[PDB]
Design a protein around this ligand. Structure first.
Ligand SMILES: NC(=O)c1ccc[n+]([C@@H]2O[C@H](COP(=O)([O-])OP(=O)(O)OC[C@H]3O[C@@H](n4cnc5c(N)ncnc54)[C@H](O)[C@@H]3O)[C@@H](O)[C@H]2O)c1
Ligand SMILES: NC(=O)c1ccc[n+]([C@@H]2O[C@H](COP(=O)([O-])OP(=O)(O)OC[C@H]3O[C@@H](n4cnc5c(N)ncnc54)[C@H](O)[C@@H]3O)[C@@H](O)[C@H]2O)c1
Ligand SMILES: NC(=O)c1ccc[n+]([C@@H]2O[C@H](COP(=O)([O-])OP(=O)(O)OC[C@H]3O[C@@H](n4cnc5c(N)ncnc54)[C@H](O)[C@@H]3O)[C@@H](O)[C@H]2O)c1
Ligand SMILES: NC(=O)c1ccc[n+]([C@@H]2O[C@H](COP(=O)([O-])OP(=O)(O)OC[C@H]3O[C@@H](n4cnc5c(N)ncnc54)[C@H](O)[C@@H]3O)[C@@H](O)[C@H]2O)c1
Ligand SMILES: NC(=O)c1ccc[n+]([C@@H]2O[C@H](COP(=O)([O-])OP(=O)(O)OC[C@H]3O[C@@H](n4cnc5c(N)ncnc54)[C@H](O)[C@@H]3O)[C@@H](O)[C@H]2O)c1
Ligand SMILES: NC(=O)c1ccc[n+]([C@@H]2O[C@H](COP(=O)([O-])OP(=O)(O)OC[C@H]3O[C@@H](n4cnc5c(N)ncnc54)[C@H](O)[C@@H]3O)[C@@H](O)[C@H]2O)c1
Ligand SMILES: O=C([O-])C(=O)[O-]
Ligand SMILES: O=C([O-])C(=O)[O-]
Ligand SMILES: O=C([O-])C(=O)[O-]
Ligand SMILES: [Mn+2]
Ligand SMILES: [Mn+2]
Ligand SMILES: [Mn+2]
Lengths: 553, 553, 553
């Protein structure tokens, strides 16, 4: 660090608070600007937990902790690391959805880069305004599909911000090499347009070619300054655009879409663990999705990749997967439109045309059910009872977020199937004890289990493009960490409390895969992949800021 | 403004948030670093009040609002300005006392300059570490007598910080020209010495000549760098040190003691207003003080100054004044020691020596009672009832702070006297409505009504030293702004809500006084002192940060 | 750029002087700090040539122009560009040698990174002290063999400094991406160890393993901060270390030795041009070197690569080469030592052992002669007359530098052979007109014709390592640019006034070779190489420093 004096305290990246040693204070011009007390990160950590403990609401907790990131970055991450599982619901789903829908009312300081349609032709000048010179990862959103909350416009910047926090909290990626970005081309949200606190352009969404050009101009600007292999993760974009930009840029830049490919990998991993207990014959699998968008089509695709690799031909696999959206069951010749992606899973209408999702379950008699409609409690008791009636061990996945949009609760799933189901959810739920004394502990099927470790692998390997088989590998790498004991408790995923090592482990496996398939370019190739990864993780412990002073012989 | 980029946003002195213009953004390198929305201070203020309204406790509010000062200085004062009366109890007494006691728990960022006994011989280098180069006003403490809370050590820094906020919020003094200072020579407070969050040196107070030498080195360092006429206000020092440092510096430097002299001025003004209703024959006045320290002795010396200038002799005036401390009534020959400042009011004991304060009232039969012991409710119902019985219109001042250390309440005072008392308090109390329907609105006899306006004047006139007559004058300037309809409500002081103009008016009147007596060195002399003063007040309105761009012919 | 105000003028990299436009001055805070006149670089250029014209000595001119590098970088390179051929003798050989030998007397400001043996163990902290963060090229020396001047210790920093100027002035490599380094481990120069103005450690050279560590620590420090593919050009190292370091590092880092490999290619090119006029049968080629060091072994080796390529075998080619050093003809069994590298060119003594270089010429009767002993006029008249007798068109290369160390002059070569010799020198010599009227314009055989264009190629291709065959291609790309007309005048190389385009053209040839041989890693690969290189060259034209201000819809 080149700076000295107060500027060191004003920048959260460097500010150590009372943890600045006396030598540091005297040598860096800080003597007098801090109380005469020298503290440790541990004392600071104590102050935090003491304070947090006394707090009452989750949003209040969110504002308190997210604020530390703007005062003392090192301490911020230390605090998450102290107990990531307990803070996850505040910092991530579901409280993050609340913060977003409230972004303008709680505003204090901005975070990330903001690029609006009004800046077209001048995006490179905006990118050059970013203080950090070595960004490696970017998470960008246009805010049209924020969780299951829909179009929140610029209030959606909360997502990319929180997403990168996990980059560092889960996989040890350097915070100063991360860049959250929000593309503001307007919002179709009538209430936000009438909101005095709204933080974006007061106009409807510009869907013309101008939009595509702005995005294209954005990708170019980012890579022109930071490099062609700068990781770019697309997050919470609308259905149409999400698929379009993925197909358009995946072979050109180092990019992927979390909602489509990250979700694909976590779901598969949970489906794999489930099979470990059911061991059902492949010719018998029959999956039915509620919803048919980004997540649904992404999961369905990884599932087919797996079945195919487990025998079945691509076409046979697809026949095992069905979808039911807001218009009904996806069957050939239906009135409602069917896109190019849904096509493969759109099949000939069965004996009868289901009117409700309950009808579908009964007619189709699926073995697995996957909720990803973002429309609330659609896995009703009747649907849950039907699944348990049809199956001995039904697999029930309600992945919509935040919690309020989920398809059903863990308690609803376990109690209604007499503890026979294998359940997973997108948002957090605690253990379930039935009137009979049995206790079931459900796992969280959320892409946070996937993106952190995959991002670290790609960054470290100087990888240029991310293929789908890279997520298939991550799926396998995550599920191979589940122990029988945990599986026994009802967990289809490793404990959230250990998400740090689980990520690092996924990174190691993925970098082993990239190098093995000639997708890595970092040289020379490391002998010991695991030691290589573990060796380059960012730590929340303070570094010495003292200059190298030494005597000459 | 020689800075551009993120730094403009990291420094609260310059940060405007979404209030930075689009042109300011494009020209200063901030485009992209802020959300697309351009806001007005008016909207920012709206976000604050909405948020504050949702909050429950005062210390939570105190943390919220004092934090704004570290994010956006201008909005901070705008927030205070929007309603100084409702925020004073949170930002000032009592809550400021609660915050000092909680200082180590609520810590987030330091404020002010910290000089410790361990830094002796290096004070200058610490002073040179302060970022601003044109400081004009300093408020310093050692934390030995924080309000009526006692020795709070470094936790007492919240006092100078708070006093200086009022320098700007009440008198329009420029924030960047203000500097809070805490002298840390240790603490005798056992509780803090075993507190892991304590912010100072872990040692008992050093009271050797090394203490004196540090104060010496402090005064010299401050004036060597900022100028000999720099205003230095002492605050909350222990009794012995407060008096000796005043005597020691008042003619060498531009310094005064707020607790001694400031309190004297506010007390006298309330007494001057009371007399407006009592019209009591000077010879009959009999004043009894509960306590005989810094505040008590200062008020007493000014009372005498008023009396002497109204006809009495110095000796004849000091005889109308009696003091009762923790050892009892001050009389000639008593065992408890009597200092040089106390002699003038230590009289030959009466017929019977009072054992309790109630006895001293019934024996001396005072017309006025002034509580300044900081020991709690020593003005008991019996004491209040005695005054109501002795005087038709008793004068009762409970000036001890915070509220818990106050001798009595407004409710108690008016009620027990049947609305016959003229009551004032150091801390805030709402209006009292007697069961007969009458309502009383008590004034706040606190030095906040005096130090801001006196400081402004002194600074503007480049005054070199402060005489007691300045305070006598300032006492006159305050009361002169009290209206009948106000006195009628029961207020012995102008409504807190207009503390801004009151302070400006007092300032104008003191600068006139300083010039008239040749104590002002600002040249040339303003013909219109009012215009002169009002002209130089700092405003909370945002300033334009745009570079001067213009076409040449 | 993120700075504004005086810093902009203090930093030579940005300073434009009166070239700062009015709008630039107003928006960036320079209004008033510059005279009211707005100038053009053309006017500034005129001012320079005007003042240089009145100057007397070459050193006085060197001091003046090198100083501009520290005041206005953009202008410094415009000045060279105006007329490189006339400035080269001042900025390069021979005046650079006089500068170095005088480095301590002419000092005003330092240039480059200095690393001493006394900083062993702390080199990384030194590297981190360099202001630029994207270095792509380094040129380093320890000053043991500065030109033919010998060991000049730290006074040799002029060499690396001058080389990098040419990197920019010749091939358009960005100046901020270049970094000259001097390794000071002491000096054996007894004179310098007695010079109160000497700029390095006052101790003889440390030749222990410590020397090896330092260099190792240096290579690691550099690569860690800037990357594994950062170009590191070695220059003017002693004989032993030059070869040992080259071998040791050529496979681990992207490095080469200018004196060994650079010189190899220039000389080969000149030889190739001569062959055009001589058409001598490859079978009768007979080269005799005067000197057996870095350059001699470097040229001989590239020479062989060609013959071998043109039919012969490595064995028979080497037999055509002979060498003669300060001890005599390199013959097997000789008293004096013959190292690993000399081996292939140390042959079985001839019937008669040559006592002097003339006798050597007489006995071996070579077709070509190449001086690279750096010990003065060893190509005596008799030796030149001999070559003329033995040969119809003798080839005479006197490459030792600086001019005073050259083997003979152009006038000596042409006159003594009656215009039949094909001559080239390392230092500059003007045209020669014989008594009979014929005018001969000699070419300069210096690596400056090679290192700039190769460096640019490597850097642009993200090349990891440099093969000797790369220098064979450079030798061809250079000679391939020669026109029969220039050859007609007597030039064996393109005119110096064209070095810029001759460099870019060589750079374009090499990146095609690199890519073609899978040695390039930049991605994707450029379709049109010429366009790719020309598009990436740095220009000395001022760039606009105005912020991006624009209207929003
Ligand atoms: N202060 C700086 O700007 C700075 C400091 C250190 C390294 N670097 C850069 O790193 C490269 C050197 O390689 P290396 O030793 O870092 O490792 P490496 O070469 O083994 O790592 C490969 C890539 O992963 C990146 N990387 C490593 N750890 C990372 C982390 N924890 N979070 C995010 N990105 C990470 C690196 O930047 C590098 O591009 C150099 O090119 C240099 O530019 C820059
Ligand atoms: N747990 C995870 O890791 C994770 C990851 C990504 C997305 N999600 C969640 O999945 C949900 C959908 O995300 P997406 O990107 O696929 O959305 P999308 O907008 O691309 O698709 C939404 C789909 O839901 C369908 N739908 C809406 N209402 C329906 C209803 N009432 N009944 C039946 N179908 C209905 C739509 O027709 C559409 O097919 C969101 O709530 C999101 O939070 C979870
Ligand atoms: N309202 C204002 O503007 C204002 C200004 C300054 C100080 N004060 C308040 O006045 C109080 C005293 O401050 P100070 O500077 O005078 O302190 P000090 O220590 O100088 O004097 C305190 C005096 O009160 C006496 N005392 C203590 N306990 C007593 C008891 N139980 N009964 C009778 N007398 C007792 C002490 O003996 C001493 O003489 C503090 O609580 C402070 O907050 C108010
Ligand atoms: N950026 C700076 O450092 C800066 C800027 C403007 C003025 N100044 C100083 O002000 C002096 C010129 O006089 P002037 O035109 O400012 O006023 P002035 O001469 O009318 O005022 C007399 C004194 O009061 C002070 N002052 C005025 N308003 C003040 C305020 N609102 N809060 C605190 N202090 C205040 C001034 O510093 C000055 O020393 C010069 O000595 C100069 O050094 C400094
Ligand atoms: N201000 C900066 O630090 C800055 C500015 C622009 C680009 N860059 C870097 O350049 C890379 C992007 O590629 P590009 O668009 O520059 O070109 P490129 O990728 O086509 O060029 C290939 C390599 O040659 C280097 N290069 C190009 N011209 C050079 C020159 N004239 N002199 C010396 N080296 C030169 C580049 O640094 C690059 O590493 C990124 O890695 C980025 O970090 C840095
Ligand atoms: N023109 C160019 O492009 C260019 C490039 C590199 C080096 N050079 C010049 O070549 C000269 C030597 O450099 P080097 O790297 O080969 O050095 P070196 O020390 O590695 O080799 C010098 C050789 O000359 C021999 N020698 C010394 N004195 C001799 C004498 N009196 N008679 C006969 N032989 C003698 C030595 O034995 C040795 O073999 C220097 O003057 C240098 O300036 C020119
Ligand atoms: O989109 C989502 O809901 C997510 O990523 O968790
Ligand atoms: O000391 C006090 O109580 C004050 O200053 O208000
Ligand atoms: O070493 C030399 O003489 C050179 O490079 O010109
Ligand atoms: Mn998402
Ligand atoms: Mn006080
Ligand atoms: Mn050289």
């Amino acid at each position: 660090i080149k700076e000295k004096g107060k500027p060191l305290m004003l920048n959260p990246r460097t500010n150590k608070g009372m943890a600045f040693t006396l030598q540091e204070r005297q040598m860096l011009g800080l003597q007098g600007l801090l109380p005469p007390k020298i503290e440790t990160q541990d004392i600071q950590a104590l102050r935090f937990h003491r304070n947090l403990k006394k707090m009452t609401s989750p949003l209040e907790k969110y504002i308190y902790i997210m604020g530390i990131q703007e005062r003392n970055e090192k301490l911020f991450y230390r605090i998450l690391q102290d107990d990531i599982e307990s803070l996850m619901p505040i910092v991530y789903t579901p409280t993050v959805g609340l913060a977003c829908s409230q972004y303008g009312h709680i505003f204090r300081r901005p975070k990330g880069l903001f690029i609006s349609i009004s800046d077209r032709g001048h995006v490179r000048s905006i990118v050059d305004n970013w203080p950090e010179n070595h960004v490696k990862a970017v998470v960008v959103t246009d805010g049209e599909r924020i969780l299951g909350l829909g179009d929140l416009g610029v209030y959606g910047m909360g997502i990319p911000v929180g997403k990168l926090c996990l980059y560092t909290a889960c996989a040890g990626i350097r915070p100063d090499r991360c860049l959250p970005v929000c593309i503001d081309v307007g919002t179709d949200n009538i209430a936000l347009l009438k909101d005095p606190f709204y933080m974006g352009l007061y106009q409807k969404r510009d869907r013309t070619q101008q939009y595509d050009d702005l995005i294209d101009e954005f990708m170019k600007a980012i890579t022109d300054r930071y490099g062609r292999n700068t990781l770019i993760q697309f997050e919470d974009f609308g259905n149409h655009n999400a698929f379009r930009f993925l197909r358009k840029y995946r072979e050109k830049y180092c990019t992927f879409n979390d909602d489509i490919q990250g979700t694909a990998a976590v779901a598969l991993a949970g489906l794999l663990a489930a099979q470990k207990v059911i061991s059902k014959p492949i010719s018998e699998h029959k999956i039915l999705f509620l919803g048919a968008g980004e997540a649904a089509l992404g999961i369905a695709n990884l599932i087919v990749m797996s079945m195919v690799e487990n025998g079945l031909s691509e076409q046979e696999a697809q026949k095992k997967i069905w979808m039911f959206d807001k218009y009904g069951l996806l069957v050939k010749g239906r009135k409602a439109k069917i896109d190019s992606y849904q096509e493969p899973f759109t099949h000939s209408a069965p004996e009868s045309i289901p009117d409700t999702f309950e009808d579908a379950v009964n007619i189709l008699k699926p073995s697995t059910i996957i909720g990803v409609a973002g429309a609330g409690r659609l896995f009703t008791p009747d649907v849950i009872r039907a699944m348990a009636s049809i199956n001995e061990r039904p697999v029930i996945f309600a992945l919509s977020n935040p919690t309020a949009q989920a398809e059903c609760t863990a308690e609803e799933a376990y109690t209604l199937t007499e503890g026979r189901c294998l359940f997973a959810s997108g948002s957090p739920f605690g253990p379930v004890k039935l009137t009979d004394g049995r206790v079931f502990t459900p796992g969280q099927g959320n892409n946070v289990y996937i993106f952190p470790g995959v991002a670290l692998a790609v960054i470290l390997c100087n990888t240029r493009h991310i293929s789908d088989s890279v997520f298939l590998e991550a799926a396998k790498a995550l599920t191979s960490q589940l122990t029988d004991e945990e599986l026994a408790q009802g967990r289809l995923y490793p404990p959230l409390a250990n998400i740090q090592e689980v990520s690092i482990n996924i990174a190691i496996k993925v970098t082993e895969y990239l190098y093995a398939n000639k997708m890595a370019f970092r040289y020379p190739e490391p002998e010991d992949k695991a030691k290589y990864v573990k060796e380059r993780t960012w730590r929340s412990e303070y570094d010495s800021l003292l200059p190298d002073v030494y005597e000459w012989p």
